Amino acid sequence: STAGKVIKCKAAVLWEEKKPFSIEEVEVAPPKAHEVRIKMVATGICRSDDHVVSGTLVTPLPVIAGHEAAGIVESIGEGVTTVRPGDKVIPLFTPQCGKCRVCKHPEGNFCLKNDLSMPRGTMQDGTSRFTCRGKPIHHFLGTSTFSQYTVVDEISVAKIDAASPLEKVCLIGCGFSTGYGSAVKVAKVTQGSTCAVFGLGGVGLSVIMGCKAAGAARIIGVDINKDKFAKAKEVGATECVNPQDYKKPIQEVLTEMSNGGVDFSFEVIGRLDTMVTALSCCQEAYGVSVIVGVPPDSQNLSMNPMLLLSGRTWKGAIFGGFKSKDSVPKLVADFMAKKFALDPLITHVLPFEKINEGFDLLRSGESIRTILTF
Amino acid sequence: STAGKVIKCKAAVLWEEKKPFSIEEVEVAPPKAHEVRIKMVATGICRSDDHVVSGTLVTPLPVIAGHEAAGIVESIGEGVTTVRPGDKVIPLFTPQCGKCRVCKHPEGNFCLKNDLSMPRGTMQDGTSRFTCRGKPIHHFLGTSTFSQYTVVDEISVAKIDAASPLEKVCLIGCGFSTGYGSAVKVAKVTQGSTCAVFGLGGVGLSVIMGCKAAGAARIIGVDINKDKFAKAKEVGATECVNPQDYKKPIQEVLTEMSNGGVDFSFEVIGRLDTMVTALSCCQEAYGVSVIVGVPPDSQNLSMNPMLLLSGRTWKGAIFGGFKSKDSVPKLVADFMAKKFALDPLITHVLPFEKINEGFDLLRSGESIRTILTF
Ligand SMILES: NC(=O)c1ccc[n+]([C@@H]2O[C@H](COP(=O)([O-])OP(=O)([O-])OC[C@H]3O[C@@H](n4cnc5c(N)[nH+]cnc54)[C@H](O)[C@@H]3O)[C@@H](O)[C@H]2O)c1
Ligand SMILES: NC(=O)c1ccc[n+]([C@@H]2O[C@H](COP(=O)([O-])OP(=O)([O-])OC[C@H]3O[C@@H](n4cnc5c(N)[nH+]cnc54)[C@H](O)[C@@H]3O)[C@@H](O)[C@H]2O)c1
Ligand SMILES: [Zn+2]
Ligand SMILES: [Zn+2]
Ligand SMILES: [Zn+2]
Ligand SMILES: [Zn+2]
């Protein structure tokens, strides 16, 4: 039995940028008040985890990364009321404290307790539950799912259906919910509209799924890797374009294709140039562009504000605009009720021990989501 | 007595940037098919007219500027159905053709027949109705209201109430409707919200009027000219701040004053730096910022897209988002029913012949709106 005890388990530690993960024994402290210790069952490889490796997304190192996952509660600290030992759960990389001005706002979801704006790499109490070779190891986004066991704050975990298939619903922890919500909740895609989706990875395919669910008439996928096109069409793209195939800039191509600009565009890559292209390709008077891709650390884009003065709307969001703890259990219930599909996003299933091979698949352009199984 | 004839009249011709207007005789051709010739009664001096002088807003020279006005139809060309001789009218610097994809869209107002995005300085048929010293003179935004007579396309004029006071309702042709609609229609300011308004000229005061009409609890005016604060408070500002008074950047000041950022911000100046500051000061998760000011020609701003990724919305608009021909007569009717006030915007009245004194008053910081009478 493990409750109240330190657990020694396997985790993938990132000791420094631009190095493979190190799969080795860590010590996981028991949960303190209002904390939850979770036995991991499955975790996805999101491009944002790779951003930690590449230094695109700055967070304190050394670190246990991973934020898209599902598992089973091993133990709860004093005062926890929302989960119990044995519950299936999804860690929430965007917390929902329920008390801050954002949590109380009808349209806010980026809870002020988040660790994304100004990353500390700790629990809410400013300390770590992880050690490795006698050194403290940082948390990542209050989740740290590349470990057989993690500890999260109560505001960073949701209880989900006991009959949930965790090797699929882990994607509701990041990529599916982000993309789908970016379409249905943040953009509010309309029936009969034309959409353009820049980036056809796991998150961009989930944007397509949402645009199709919202009734878009046309969904134009845009990627420099034409190997991504077939799956984009399977989940709802009506046509795909590779910017490398054209002499003109792709904003001009998309404006022409849409007879004067698209209704909704999405940047789902993480490049400054594609954020400006995606804004420019939406109709100048009434178009909406949503930034989903995480930009490179501390870099500014350049744009002409006449793009906005004519009437465009530009916005971004974390986690598809979903209030995380309210939404994740409902999304899982909706998946159980066959309201959407997750299998199209899953190209590879590997044991956790093959994490580096999973990242190599993403980096090579050869995967959408790899699910790692513990 | 002038129908079908060239009219010789006085106009204010701008021959050169950064020079006084020349009040001199022009020839005004009669209206062609679907054109309307208007005897001007009153015209306001909007900062955008000054932008033509300063080269902030590029349009071909020589030009008859003026776009905020009211007058009486002198004659109509063949096929005109929406106005008749003797009707009171407001020229529409944003047309409403009723046929393009923007005019058909429920939100859109920036009709594709506009002359603002890529100014040519002509009528819709690519020609000019004005001659001066035997030389063709450009139009401005299809209106050219700094003339005793102008000719406009039918899609650029609205019939208004016969009992309208033209020396007041000319402001519905630009500055009032722009500011008021930017608050009520484009931002959709909510009851109990906190708003920040950058720039307290005629347009920014109109934004304040709209925020107060929408029920905002706090309306923070921001201007480097503290002489602007008294009138801002009269029309609904709850407090005013001068960035020059503070050691810290004003986005930090406003974030602190609003206990974490404002609900709605407005840039009503025309500076790249204040567009970014106004975005930054709205709450990072659910804030909305609206660009109203006209930026300097062809210049790009620099910004960090993490400001949007957290959840901010950034938009801009022309003419307050109003569909011009539908909306102007209704706004006049509402004014006549005392639903809003225009007198707080009018600080000076001059004859048209004193147009250069009117521009001196604007440039010195003294005026809000000067109304010129023909
Ligand atoms: N906002 C959020 O909450 C959130 C959540 C999840 C992911 N993200 C970010 O979203 C982005 C996509 O994540 P993902 O789907 O896991 O990544 P991914 O699987 O790497 O997909 C990115 C796609 O972009 C394509 N691409 C690369 N460069 C270009 C280019 N110049 N033009 C067009 N296509 C290009 C690329 O070929 C790939 O298919 C990353 O930046 C993530 O960090 C954000
Ligand atoms: N979008 C549209 O349809 C539309 C319509 C009408 C006017 N405009 C633009 O809106 C802007 C305002 O027009 P207006 O009200 O006639 O002009 P205005 O009367 O010149 O007012 C601008 C105000 O900005 C103040 N100001 C200048 N610099 C700063 C600074 N750094 N920080 C804070 N305040 C500052 C200034 O003191 C003045 O009171 C101009 O750029 C116009 O061209 C746009
Ligand atoms: Zn919160
Ligand atoms: Zn992610
Ligand atoms: Zn139109
Ligand atoms: Zn104006």
The CATH number assigned to the domain holding A209 equals 3.40.50.720
Residue A271's CB is within 10 A of a number of other CB atoms, namely 17
Q: Which residues contact B319 (CB under 8 A, 6 or more apart)?
A: B93, B94, B109, B174, B177, B178, B181
Q: Is B296 exposed, middle or buried (0-12, 13-18, 19+ CB in 10 A)?
A: middle
Whether residue A39 contacts residue A148, with contact meaning beta carbons closer than 8 Å, is answered with yes
Contact across the interface for B110 and A311, Cβ inside 8 Å: yes
Which residues of chain A have a CB within 8 Å of the CB of B270? none
Report phi then psi at B102, rounded to 5: -70, -50
How many Cα atoms sit within 13 Å of A9 on the Cβ side? 25
Beta-carbon contacts below 8 Å between A and B: 130
3-state SS track over A19-37: CCCEEEEEEECCCCCCEEE
What is d(CA B346, CA B343) in angstroms, rounded to the nearest whole number?
5
Q: At what angle do helices B250-257 and B272-281 cross, to 10 degrees?
A: 20
Of A300, A302, A310, the CB nearest to B318: A310
What is d(CA A321, CA B308) in angstroms, rounded to the nearest whole number?
12
- The technique is X-ray
- Nearest CA to B282 out of B372, B162, B172, B193 is that of B193
Is A34 catalytic? The answer is no
Closest C-alpha to ligand 1, atom 24: A199
Query: How is residue B237 written in tokens?
Result: 């500002």
Biggest CA pair distance of chain B: 65
Of A259, A300, A315, the CB nearest to B308: A315
What is d(CA A205, CA A197) in angstroms, rounded to the nearest whole number?
9
Whether residue B348 contacts residue B323, with contact meaning beta carbons closer than 8 Å, is answered with no
- DSSP-assigned beta bridge partners for residue B239: B220
Report phi then psi at B314, rounded to 5: -125, 125
| 3-state class (DSSP) for residue B39 | strand
Å from CA of B372 to ligand 3 middle = 54
What is d(CA A81, CA A96) in angstroms, rounded to the nearest whole number?
14
The owner of tokens 């000791």 is A15
Å from CA of A316 to ligand 4 middle = 15
| 3-state class (DSSP) for residue B289 | strand
Preceding amide of B295 cis, omega within 30:
no
Å from CA of B276 to ligand 1 middle = 26
For chain B, strand residue ranges (E) read 7-13, 22-28, 35-44, 69-76, 88-91, 130-132, 135-137, 149-153, 157-159, 194-198, 218-222, 239-241, 264-267, 288-291, 301-303, 313-316, 346-351, 369-373
What is d(CA B238, CA B317) in angstroms, rounded to the nearest whole number?
25
Report phi then psi at B357, rounded to 5: -60, -40
| 3-state class (DSSP) for residue A266 | strand
For A166-298, strand residue ranges (E) read 194-198, 218-222, 239-241, 264-267, 288-291
In order, the DSSP letters of B215-245 are T-SEEEEE-S-GGGHHHHHHHT-SEEE-GGG
What is d(CA B209, CA B238) in angstroms, rounded to the nearest whole number?
12
Query: How is residue A160 written in tokens?
Result: 């989900």
Whole-number CA gyration radius for chain B: 20
Closest C-alpha to ligand 2, atom 23: B199
CA angle A293, A297, A299 (to 5 degrees): 90
Give the distance from CA B311 to its chain's centroid: 29
Query: How is residue B162 written in tokens?
Result: 């016969």
B244 lines ligand 2 (CB under 6 A): no
Å from CA of B358 to ligand 1 middle = 54
The one catalytic residue in A34, A48, A164, A177 is A48
B140 lines ligand 2 (CB under 6 A): no
Which residues of chain A have a CB within 8 Å of the CB of B318? 309-311
A84, A164, A242, A339, B272 from A325: Cα distances, Å: 15, 16, 37, 19, 39
The one catalytic residue in A46, A211, A240, A281 is A46
Is B46 catalytic? The answer is yes
Query: How is residue A102 written in tokens?
Result: 């954002």
The one catalytic residue in A9, A22, A34, A51 is A51
The one catalytic residue in A75, A144, A156, A174 is A174
In order, the DSSP letters of B317-339 are -SGGG--HHHHHHHHHHHHHTTS
Establish if B296 touches chain A: CB-CB under 8 angstroms.
no
Contact across the interface for A286 and B311, Cβ inside 8 Å: no
Query: How is residue B290 written in tokens?
Result: 């609206």
Closest C-alpha to ligand 2, atom 21: B201
Q: Which residues contact A330 (CB under 8 A, 6 or more apart)?
A: none
Q: Is A313 exposed, middle or buried (0-12, 13-18, 19+ CB in 10 A)?
A: buried
Which ligand ends up closest to the CA of A50? 1
- Resolution number, Å: 1.1
Establish if A107 touches chain B: CB-CB under 8 angstroms.
yes
- Identify the H or E element spanning A278: helix A272-281
Sign of CA dihedral A256, A259, A260, A264: negative
| 3-state class (DSSP) for residue A10 | strand
Chain interruptions in chain A, by residue before each (C–N > 2.5 Å): none
Establish if A260 touches chain B: CB-CB under 8 angstroms.
yes
| 3-state class (DSSP) for residue A195 | strand
- Identify the H or E element spanning A69: strand A69-76
Establish if B279 touches chain A: CB-CB under 8 angstroms.
no
The DSSP bridge pattern shows strands B239-241 and B218-222 to be: parallel
DSSP state of A116: S
Which of A109, A269, A306 to probe by mutation at the B interface, max B CB count within 10 Å? A306
Å from CA of B347 to ligand 2 middle = 16
- Nearest CA to B183 out of B235, B239, B136 is that of B235
- Nearest CA to B40 out of B131, B166, B175 is that of B166
B113 lines ligand 2 (CB under 6 A): no
Report phi then psi at A289, rounded to 5: -125, 130
The owner of tokens 């923070």 is B220
Preceding amide of A119 cis, omega within 30:
no
What is d(CA B93, CA B325) in angstroms, rounded to the nearest whole number?
10
Q: Which amino acid is at B272?
A: L
Burial B25-47 (b: 16+ CB within 10 A, else e): ebbbbbbbebbbbbbbbbbbbbb
Which residues of chain A have a CB within 8 Å of the CB of B312? 315-316
The owner of tokens 């609609």 is B181
CA angle B305, B223, B272 (to 5 degrees): 30
Nearest CA in chain B to A283: B102
Q: Is A260 exposed, middle or buried (0-12, 13-18, 19+ CB in 10 A)?
A: middle
The DSSP bridge pattern shows strands A313-316 and A288-291 to be: parallel
What is the span of the domain harbouring residue A292?
176-320
Give the distance from CA A207 to its chain's centroid: 12
What is d(CA A318, CA A179) in angstroms, rounded to the nearest whole number?
10
Which residues of chain A have a CB within 8 Å of the CB of B275? 305
Whether residue A285 contacts residue B110, with contact meaning beta carbons closer than 8 Å, is answered with yes
Closest-CA distance, B178 to chain A, in angstroms, reads: 12
Residue A106's CB is within 10 A of a number of other CB atoms, namely 7
Query: How is residue B197 written in tokens?
Result: 């308004």
Of A101, A309, A318, the CB nearest to B316: A309
Q: Is B2 exposed, middle or buried (0-12, 13-18, 19+ CB in 10 A)?
A: middle
